[PDB]
Subunit: 275 residues, 3 copies
Amino acid sequence: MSPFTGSAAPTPEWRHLRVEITDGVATVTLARPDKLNALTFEAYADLRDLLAELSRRRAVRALVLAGEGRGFCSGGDVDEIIGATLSMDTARLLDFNRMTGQVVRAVRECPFPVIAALHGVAAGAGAVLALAADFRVADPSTRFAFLFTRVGLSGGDMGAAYLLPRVVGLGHATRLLMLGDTVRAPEAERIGLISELTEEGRADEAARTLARRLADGPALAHAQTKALLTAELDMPLAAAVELDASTQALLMTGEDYAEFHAAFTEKRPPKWQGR
Amino acid sequence: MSPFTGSAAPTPEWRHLRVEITDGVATVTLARPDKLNALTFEAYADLRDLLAELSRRRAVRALVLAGEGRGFCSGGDVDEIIGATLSMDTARLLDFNRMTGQVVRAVRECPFPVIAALHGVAAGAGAVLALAADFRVADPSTRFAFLFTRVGLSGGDMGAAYLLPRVVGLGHATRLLMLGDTVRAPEAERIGLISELTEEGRADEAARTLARRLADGPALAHAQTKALLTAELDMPLAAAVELDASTQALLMTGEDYAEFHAAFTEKRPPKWQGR
Amino acid sequence: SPFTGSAAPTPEWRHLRVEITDGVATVTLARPDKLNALTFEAYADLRDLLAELSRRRAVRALVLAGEGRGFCSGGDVDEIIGATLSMDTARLLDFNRMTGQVVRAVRECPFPVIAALHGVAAGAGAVLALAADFRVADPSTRFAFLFTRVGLSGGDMGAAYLLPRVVGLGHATRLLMLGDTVRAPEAERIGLISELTEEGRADEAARTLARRLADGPALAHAQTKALLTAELDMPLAAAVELDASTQALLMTGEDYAEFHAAFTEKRPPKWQGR
Ligand SMILES: [Zn+2]
Ligand SMILES: [Zn+2]
């Protein structure tokens, strides 16, 4: 845990999503299965604020993002978001779109791996949240749809036009984002959108197993792996090797690197501490 | 379209390529099936000048790039291009190579989607033109050859070294550009070069159908999807979400977004206007 | 290239095997018994050799190979890891800078680099292969980016920059974070393999590819690599400027002119690399 806290206290209760933490693994289950977990303004606000809170306290070592019911997440609620935005002032339109983009950025920047447990529909914001995760663990019913243009918006929504070509290549990104057609599991797997394909109904269990695998590993090493992937997407080669050099040298002063060698020489399992 | 015209008038007749516009869709057909549609200096000049004139008046909602005869385009005419360049002065050599790269840039930047209808060979410049398009609609005879090195020039010609790795990955791009070997339809599909694979002989019809599909949709949403994809290839994550935020907020003030919600509430199809 | 000064070429390379024939350099990693595990001195030789070969433009292609049961298992657990555990801050930084500089030097060589893969390619072995322009691999090839297995991050010596640009961010995150083995079929599917050979034929296929490249127009090949590498880090408008200058320049070269001469008279072009 991080000692760098001040006047601000942790939120006692998260009302717009379900948050459970066990042994360093957070599980965030989207609310509203009867609506395919369609997101509201308040759910975005809780995503933003929860991630900021977990990040500043270095609270967990892995996070699973899940949805109950018939699918993962259908995106923003058509009445509670879209209908409401039709009567918002200019500043509040900008604030809403900035908030969703900073949710995706917060997923990309939080000091622990994020795993999306996917099944049925992941559409609109649901598909971008999945895309921002470090891992997508998906069952065969999983259907992505980047369908912003179908509501008259651009496919550059909350980072999708930045992330998608970096995951699947520019030719596939353009097709997916401009036409908004459904991408079923086999195509998704072929083009690079799936980290682990599971058996039908097993996505949540496999996501939990992957989370625990990561949480059992060297946390600082994992978190810095994510940090360097993310930063170096936006850096030139010469700068990337400077960040690598600094980071690897720092980690070589850590307990975990020393423990690897001690365990290796003593022919036993390493016991990681994440420092 | 766009009222922002001044003293400059539209070109009445395009002489070095065939241009046809029907109901917001431009079809540009390369001339010279006899010569495998090899590109002349004037053909490049007409591409440059037509895209500029289509762009500055937002004239169309989609553009198909096509080639008659046995194949899409064999590249630069060997007698008419290479032979001529061998007696050019230093400023003209630079002018020529600037113009070709400009053409590719203009394809990436024009405010409407561009579709390449591919069959037979797309080689050299013809391969790069196809690569720059937003969609590549290809029948099974389609071949790509990025074969600049075969003529003693570098494979990073007119933007190929920039675009190809962002479409197929750095490993594949290196191999394609350094060796210049033919890529046939199955490999092209595998590595991400093909947007839609058609039956033999159906590429032009399928491209037309796709263009009409795009032209029937919300044109401003499509255009911004392309602009954001293009710009965000060259931006960091934090900047990308600021561009997404301004753009989406802007589109939420548009008629097409409002019409999506109106259509939804009356359970009817949206009638898009592109504003 | 004639641009040499007080500094003389290194007479003998003790920490790897270096053989040059008709413009092709073959670099064979030492220590086949230890799966060619790297020492500090092996890294130093890679750095210093690549710098010599580059400043002289001595070679038109370079093959990176390893003998024994596998390509390269990475840094030596005793001679590197063991040693690093008692190093001071400055030397820890120095070491990790050196490894990244070797990878950068591979990306910046003015000739193509080809990795001849088979068996295990792990840790630095995986990243060295990743940095090569071509990966020529037989079906036994197994990649493992296993830095996190030793408590270090997957952003070792450029891996976090290179891998997503080769296989996509989703695959790169998986590979670098879990460090699981990637066998040949998967490697092929995700874009890590340039040419898949039959068992035991990687070194031969690599030799053949190197010669194919050394037989071609060398300036065109080198600039192809230079532009690919630079343009990964440049925006589109700047990339077409670099292409413009470069193509204009190569159009003043002998090879381009030779091509028109040749292709005209239906005789094969005879390249000169200028
Ligand atoms: Zn990519
Ligand atoms: Zn980039």
